[PDB]
Amino acid sequence: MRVTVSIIKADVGGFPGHAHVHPKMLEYAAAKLKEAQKRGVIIDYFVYNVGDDISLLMTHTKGEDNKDIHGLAWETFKEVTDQIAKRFKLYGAGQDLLKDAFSGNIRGMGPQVAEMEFEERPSEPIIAFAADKTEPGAFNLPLYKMFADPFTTAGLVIDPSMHEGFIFEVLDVVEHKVYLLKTPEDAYSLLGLIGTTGRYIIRKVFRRADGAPAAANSVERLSLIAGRYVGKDDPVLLVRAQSGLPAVGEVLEAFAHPHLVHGWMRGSHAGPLMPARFISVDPERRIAIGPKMTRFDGPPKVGALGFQLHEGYLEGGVDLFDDPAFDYVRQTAAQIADYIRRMGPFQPHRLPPEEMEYTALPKILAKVKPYPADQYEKDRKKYIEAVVKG
Amino acid sequence: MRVTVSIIKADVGGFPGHAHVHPKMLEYAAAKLKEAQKRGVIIDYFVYNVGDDISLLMTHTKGEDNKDIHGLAWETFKEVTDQIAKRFKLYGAGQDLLKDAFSGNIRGMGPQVAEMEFEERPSEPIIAFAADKTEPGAFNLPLYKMFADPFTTAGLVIDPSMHEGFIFEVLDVVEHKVYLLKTPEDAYSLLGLIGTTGRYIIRKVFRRADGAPAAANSVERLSLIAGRYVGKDDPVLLVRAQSGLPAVGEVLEAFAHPHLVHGWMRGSHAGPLMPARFISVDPERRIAIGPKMTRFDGPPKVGALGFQLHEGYLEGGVDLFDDPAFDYVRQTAAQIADYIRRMGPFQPHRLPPEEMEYTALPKILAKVKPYPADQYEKDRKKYIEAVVKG
Amino acid sequence: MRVTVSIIKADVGGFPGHAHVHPKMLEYAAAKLKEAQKRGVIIDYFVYNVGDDISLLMTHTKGEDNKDIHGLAWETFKEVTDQIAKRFKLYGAGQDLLKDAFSGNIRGMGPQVAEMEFEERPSEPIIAFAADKTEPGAFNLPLYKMFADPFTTAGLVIDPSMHEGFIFEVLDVVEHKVYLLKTPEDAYSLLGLIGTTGRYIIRKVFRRADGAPAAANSVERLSLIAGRYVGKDDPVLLVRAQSGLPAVGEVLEAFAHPHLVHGWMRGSHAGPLMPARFISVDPERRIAIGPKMTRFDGPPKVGALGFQLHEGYLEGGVDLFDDPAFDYVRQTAAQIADYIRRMGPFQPHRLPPEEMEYTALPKILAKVKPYPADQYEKDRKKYIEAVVKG
Amino acid sequence: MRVTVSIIKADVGGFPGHAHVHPKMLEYAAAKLKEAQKRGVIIDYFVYNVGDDISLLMTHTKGEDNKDIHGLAWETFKEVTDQIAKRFKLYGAGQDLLKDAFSGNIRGMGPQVAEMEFEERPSEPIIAFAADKTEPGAFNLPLYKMFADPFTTAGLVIDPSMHEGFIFEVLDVVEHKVYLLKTPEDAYSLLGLIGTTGRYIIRKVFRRADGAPAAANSVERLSLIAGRYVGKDDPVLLVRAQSGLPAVGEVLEAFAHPHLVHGWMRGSHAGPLMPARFISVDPERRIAIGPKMTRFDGPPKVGALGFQLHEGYLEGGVDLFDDPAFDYVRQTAAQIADYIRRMGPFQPHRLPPEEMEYTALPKILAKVKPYPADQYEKDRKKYIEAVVKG
Ligand SMILES: O=C(COP(=O)(O)O)[C@@H](O)[C@H](O)[C@H](O)COP(=O)(O)O
Ligand SMILES: O=C(COP(=O)(O)O)[C@@H](O)[C@H](O)[C@H](O)COP(=O)(O)O
Ligand SMILES: O=C(COP(=O)(O)O)[C@@H](O)[C@H](O)[C@H](O)COP(=O)(O)O
Ligand SMILES: O=C(COP(=O)(O)O)[C@@H](O)[C@H](O)[C@H](O)COP(=O)(O)O
Ligand SMILES: [Mg+2]
Ligand SMILES: [Mg+2]
Ligand SMILES: [Mg+2]
Ligand SMILES: [Mg+2]
Ligand SMILES: [Mg+2]
Ligand SMILES: [Mg+2]
Ligand SMILES: [Mg+2]
Ligand SMILES: [Mg+2]
Ligand SMILES: [Mg+2]
Ligand SMILES: [Mg+2]
Ligand SMILES: [Mg+2]
Ligand SMILES: [Mg+2]
Ligand SMILES: [Mg+2]
Ligand SMILES: [Mg+2]
Ligand SMILES: [Mg+2]
Ligand SMILES: [Mg+2]
């Protein structure tokens, strides 16, 4: 049977600030999806947060880009907004749905979606990822590693079924152009694009041998609003594993170096991506509570839940960053976070100016007097005396 | 609607010594505040300890410096004293209320208060802090950082709504004088005062753009008793966050370096301020149990609980030091505590003599024979022979 | 007496690659400057390298922007080129003087200059810095710290002679505009500019009390060549110290966090700025041999030589990063270098695309087929089957 | 034969700033003492620096407090001043001799002296210490440890010849009073005094069994100048070792924890005392070049030179901090220095106000408007509106 797996994610309020979600939001969402399941809209579901982002993972047979499934998610987020977030006056209530939400970040751009449709294999292990305080390009390095780096995915070299590699669908989110690159042969060209994490983002990956969908990342084109590019952050990602696709452990190895990503405070910094445990996982209630964002509204975090599909039912989720081996990775991220923070307001800890979600540069340039450089050389002594006397 | 948020804190007994509180004290206090809520005295509340200090966080509409609210707290502490602490003969039972409590530290000086009244915003995130084994000036460094240090609060540079800075109300607790300083321009003068943490303490902070209350720290003037200055330690602090006020994560960043503070053993040492987890947080019962004070009666610790206000009701609290990123900070504090303790009785691990809560110097000077220095030079050989023969 | 201190620096060949200089280049330069000294062109000099960059430090009385002094340096570099670098076929022989040098990086842009003229004080301590494998904005963070950060320069708070702060001359190297900002009051605006290290660079600093020159950094406007901005990297910096200017140790404290800077391999990465020892310092021969660039052509390094001026004569230089306290800083930089390198070709370890000195993006875009995104959605299955069958 | 060992120390100029000395100063001093030796004024000598402080170690038979020996030192420092420091316009030329030296710290207070007279033992091992960037009380902890702490000096417990302990001569430098305390019995009283490192300083130690001089520290009473106490910093210390006095290694163990001391930048901070190697030791030329002061004008450092006396001749010196065991201690000090520096201008990293060598507090209090606290409560809203509108 063919199944679709859809993650539709949104922030509709934080608790407090942008640090976390209120547990009643998860409970409300789970109850709403249980009703949809009883009506046959969906087969199964799992509800979880990372930071202030709620992921609705849903299995169904309606295909990709389905209005009923996308509409079920939207309605669930709108009802969480109105019944829970507005009731408790949560921070940024309705953030991703309402352009006038009470927060100062990018609002009203809508949910994000990562989805795949496929014939369910004789065993169908999948991993759902969610990150907070980062951009969709945060997953470029891990996706490259797991599908194309022989230092990550041993199977590329030792599993004859993987020898032919993978096909990357890369979205230029500025010009709205798609590129298809094949590894190993196009590795250098691919990296020339996807190293620019804010512009060229891996959106989908397919197995080269047969075209099977292997991963789907939530990324959309940017919008140009009041002369700035405006994106949708805090990505979600679906990866299918095993049997010629990377092993669960090869997928997870791709997150074992907590690389610097763009986001963190005010969408305007770089910090290490910490692979984080869930606070709690309740398979029966279909809810996981993910990590909080604390120092400097982070560091950026990613959570990983594994599942096994059966006739579209989801057995799981299983927290896949829960191992002492990943404690070392978290400790590294914590130390790097402390190191980089001592840079304060300077690039490359602060992002390049065009990549900053917040800026005061127009306010600054409206007040600080410029001097054409060539004329300034003649007048410098005069201008310095004027400040001094001034 | 306008709301007042009041934290009124006291130590009325420890369990054991000065290390912690008895959980029945928290339960008694919560039950008493629930009765006040039913009668309409207060809107909502949360009860928690850090070390041996119990904070009663209360929301209400009676304004600052209200006799009913201050009296409700006093009565709650007196009843905890009589019903719980005296019953179990807790250490320092009634400490802050009774000058004759059974402990050897400063007694009977009264509760402390941190409170703010304001129009409740469309979302109203607040953080309540409590520290044990330190002075109110322990918060000088964090408050300075979060409101004035561009290496902490990115918004000062990148959020045009924050560009105008903040107004610090600084209390000289020796001469009972208030100073108002504005950052950025008065930063150096401000620091010249508040670096003297025992004398010049940040009591309130206001937003410069509109005068909005931003933070309130519990500090009062010193009392001169038997020729020593006597202060009220173990401060509490309220901070409003977001939307032109520092982000929750910028507030928390201000605690990410575990700086040395005055207090620790016997109110007479310097040690690192450890940002500590709560042992437990129960939002339904309205109680959090904070950390214990162990080695050398510390190290000094601060706890952070976040809330969202709605019509004065408190949704929370949320432990905001609960992240692996803060595990690194705690480990640093633990290592610094071990390093500094090897100094034993010497400044600057021991405090300056006028800053020590305990001293034996009068006992010492009553017994040890002085010699005027000029005459001692002539007699030194004689005096050494007299000790030797002696 | 008034004196001018000029550092004029260039790379005219490496040994091997871009890692270091040949010692005969330094010996040749020193001999040439000794001849100029005998003729009265200059008072005194010191010759040294950091990585592949040779600094000619010269004292004289000809003022800033003097053709004789600039011409003496140019001629010295041209003769080193022809007599030494071309003789031994050094790598990038004549790099900064010859557009057709044999190297693949930016060539022929000319030497850089950092110079100050002033009345020589009753004691005149100065520090000369040189960095390799980085941009002039690498010094933005240190210069800000030493002149404006009270966590670095204690004197801003505790030395009444410094209370009035400093004046920063900031160059916009894209639009060729100069801004004058005064600290403390303009700190936030200043940081809003100079955090963009590739665009807004501190060129000079002056004391606010009297206008005295305090620092001079080597930065020039960019050139727009074949549609890319082309800059002059590997900066040099002069700082005057003490007596109302930052102490030598406050200047050095500003380098005690090895912050990430732009440059390193191929002028296209970010890595930690390591404060490095000189290999050797010979005050009598007037030559210091600085550090090599090794792993990944770095990490980026800065060297610091202190001097005392007397009637323009230079007593020194003294290696000011030579202390076990700075061994810790170097070890931190070495560890951060290893961490960040595991990112490979990805931002923010790789620089933003417009900031990269090397790029293959045009070659890539000439070969990889784009698909307009809207039409790609309809054709995706077809295109994937075509790659698969292909 | 009876011998006197005298260390007379002064700063008469730095190279650069307060970081180090010029090597010609040491060479000049050694040459001058060689002439005094030829004339029979002294028996032997050794000349060395730590940071910007030059120690003249001299052996002779003229006794303590001898005008000829003190005058020889003064004259040597005055000639170094005039012939070397003023010639090269060194920083703070003549610092400790000239009230109008060109530096901003405490000037003209004179050299310091540590001296002992005794019958030369059948073997006479002695250690000379010098510290820079700290007060004489920096040696209180080490002197206490080596003579009174059984966790340091094993001989107190296991060497029957040491069982009777030691006599401490403690100087109150504020009131000019001397106390004599005997360990073990007076340990607690002693520590009650000498923990106040700025006031009660160990000046001499004697063996209790026979009164033999065991140590001499350079400390003098403070001077009250323009309402501030003014002291003489950067102490020197002589310790006799072995045979009922602490072993060389017990003396050195007392420095193996790099405890926080007062001094460092601007005489106004606390930082770890690093036991440092000499850069070079030349026994034949009678000169050792000690460490530089770098980050933040430190950290504070102590050097240790061991000697064996024979008929007053000095065989040595031997650098006693030169062992990998002390590399660990230095690394600890380097890490603690980095930790504490993140506190910036705040106590207890900044010193208590009365202990600061530099302050801007009068300048601050002359400009910042005070409000009596009781009246401020009524007017606060008005004053905040006035700043806001202002
Ligand atoms: O060693 C492994 C499994 O052995 P096990 O069942 O524990 O004996 C795994 O590493 C697998 O080899 C890996 O996950 C690839 O599995 P397939 O995708 O080939 O099933
Ligand atoms: O990036 C952040 C929030 O993004 P998110 O909701 O996770 O997309 C935060 O760092 C906020 O920018 C920060 O807390 C300031 O928020 P405001 O006070 O401007 O709402
Ligand atoms: O073990 C030691 C010497 O043994 P050694 O000569 O190496 O056999 C030292 O620790 C001494 O015991 C110590 O220095 C005390 O020596 P005295 O002062 O008793 O001579
Ligand atoms: O403590 C210091 C010097 O003391 P010293 O000569 O060793 O007694 C330095 O930190 C100076 O205070 C600092 O360099 C500032 O010096 P000035 O610029 O005021 O001379
Ligand atoms: Mg949010
Ligand atoms: Mg989010
Ligand atoms: Mg965001
Ligand atoms: Mg988001
Ligand atoms: Mg108590
Ligand atoms: Mg307490
Ligand atoms: Mg107390
Ligand atoms: Mg208390
Ligand atoms: Mg080169
Ligand atoms: Mg170079
Ligand atoms: Mg270059
Ligand atoms: Mg170059
Ligand atoms: Mg000096
Ligand atoms: Mg000194
Ligand atoms: Mg000094
Ligand atoms: Mg001195």
By what technique were these coordinates determined? X-ray
Q: Residues C253, D296: contact at Cβ < 8 Å? A: yes
Give the span between the Cα atoms of B176 and B169, in whole angstroms: 13
* Nearest-neighbour CA in chain C from A310: distance (Å): 26
Q: Shortest CA distance to D130 belongs to which of D315, D332, D294, D305?
A: D305
Tokens at C50, concatenated: 């950091």
**What domains appear along chain B, each with residue ranges and CATH number?**
1-358 (no CATH), 359-390 (6.10.250.1180)
Please work out, in degrees rounded to the nearest 5, the angle formed at the alpha carbon of residue D273 by the alpha carbons of D271 and D278: 135
Quickly tell me which residue has 């994490």 as its tokens. A197
**Distance, CA of A349 to chain centre:** 19
Please work out, in degrees rounded to the nearest 5, the angle formed at the alpha carbon of residue D166 by the alpha carbons of D163 and D169: 170
Tokens at B272, concatenated: 């690192």
Quickly tell me which residue has 């995104």 as its tokens. C373
A44: β partners: A59
Q: Is D223 annotated as a binding residue?
A: no
Instruction: Give the number of the ligand closest to the Cα of residue B300.
Output: 10
Tokens at C91, concatenated: 């790598």
Q: Shortest CA distance to C155 belongs to which of D210, D17, A340, D314?
A: D17
Point out the ligand 4 atom lying closest to the alpha carbon of residue D11: 6
B377: β partners: none
Give the span between the Cα atoms of C306 and C329, in whole angstroms: 19
Q: Residues C220, C112: contact at Cβ < 8 Å? A: yes
Which residues approach ligand 1 with their CB closer than 6 A? A 242-243, 247, 249
Peptide bond into A16 cis (omega under 30): yes
**Distance, CA of C37 to chain centre:** 26
B182 backbone dihedrals φ, ψ, rounded to 5°: -115, 130
Quickly tell me which residue has 């703010």 as its tokens. B116
Active site residue ranges of D: 11, 229, 232
* Encoded amino acid at C66, one letter: N
Chains near D (3 or more Cβ pairs under 8 Å): B, C
Tokens at C177, concatenated: 């505009």
Question: A32, A145, A204, A232: which one is catalytic?
Answer: A232
* Encoded amino acid at A291, one letter: P
Q: Which residues of D160-185 are buried (b: 16+ CB within 10 A; e: fewer)?
A: eebebbbbbbbbbbeeebbbbbbbee
Q: Shortest CA distance to B10 belongs to which of B83, B89, B84, B93?
A: B93
Helix (H, G, I), strand (E, B) or coil at A292: coil
Give the span between the Cα atoms of C55 and C113, in whole angstroms: 9
Active site residue ranges of C: 11, 229, 232
The strand pair at C223-225 and B228-230 is best described as unpaired
The strand pair at C200-207 and C213-217 is best described as antiparallel
Could you tell me where the beta strands, DSSP code E, fall in A61-165? 112-119, 124-132
Q: Is D100 annotated as a binding residue?
A: no
Which H or E element spans position B145? Answer: helix B140-148
Contacts of B347 (CB under 8 A, 6+ apart): D195, D196, D197, D198, D262
Q: Residues D47, D67: contact at Cβ < 8 Å? A: no
Chains near B (3 or more Cβ pairs under 8 Å): A, C, D
Residues with CB under 5 A from ligand 10 (ion): B 11, 52-53, 132, 234
Give the span between the Cα atoms of C120 and C126, in whole angstroms: 11
Q: Shortest CA distance to D291 belongs to which of D82, D49, D127?
A: D49
Interface test with B, best of D65, D178, D382 (most B CBs within 10 A): D178
Point out the ligand 4 atom lying closest to the alpha carbon of residue D52: 7
Contacts of C48 (CB under 8 A, 6+ apart): C26, C54, C55, C57, C130, C278, C287, C288, C289, C290, C303, C305, C317
Please work out, in degrees rounded to the nearest 5, the angle formed at the alpha carbon of residue C33 by the alpha carbons of C28 and C38: 130
Q: Residues C321, C277: contact at Cβ < 8 Å? A: yes
Please report, for chain B, how many H helices and E strands are present, in that order.
9, 20
Helix (H, G, I), strand (E, B) or coil at A219: coil
Q: Which residues of B322-358 are buried (b: 16+ CB within 10 A; e: fewer)?
A: bbbbbbbbbebbeebbebbbebbbbbbbbbbbebbbe
Q: Shortest CA distance to A22 belongs to which of A287, A233, A236, A264?
A: A287
Quickly tell me which residue has 């620092």 as its tokens. C215
* Encoded amino acid at B68, one letter: D
Q: Residues B240, B124: contact at Cβ < 8 Å? A: yes
DSSP character at residue B354: G
C-alpha C93 to ligand 14 mean position (Å): 12
Q: Is D44 annotated as a binding residue?
A: no
A204 backbone dihedrals φ, ψ, rounded to 5°: -145, 155
B256: left (phi over 0), alpha (psi -120 to 50) or beta: alpha
Substitution candidate for ligand 4 out of D15, D52, D103 with most atoms within 8 A of CB: D103
A267 backbone dihedrals φ, ψ, rounded to 5°: 55, 25
Q: Shortest CA distance to D21 belongs to which of C126, C306, C324?
A: C306
D318: left (phi over 0), alpha (psi -120 to 50) or beta: beta
Question: A78, A149, A182, A229: which one is catalytic?
Answer: A229
Could you tell me where the beta strands, DSSP code E, fall in C173-275? 177-183, 200-207, 213-217, 223-225, 228-230, 236-240, 260-263, 269-272, 274-275
Q: How far is CA D47 from CA A99, C123, D76, D389, in A?
A: 75, 25, 11, 65
Q: Residues A54, A26: contact at Cβ < 8 Å? A: yes
Residues of D in contact with C127 (CB under 8 A): 16
Q: Residues B237, B140: contact at Cβ < 8 Å? A: no
CB atoms closer than 10 angstroms to residue C176 = 15
Q: Shortest CA distance to D52 belongs to which of D11, D109, D99?
A: D11
Q: Residues C178, C171: contact at Cβ < 8 Å? A: yes
Q: Residues D370, D383: contact at Cβ < 8 Å? A: no
Helix (H, G, I), strand (E, B) or coil at A99: coil
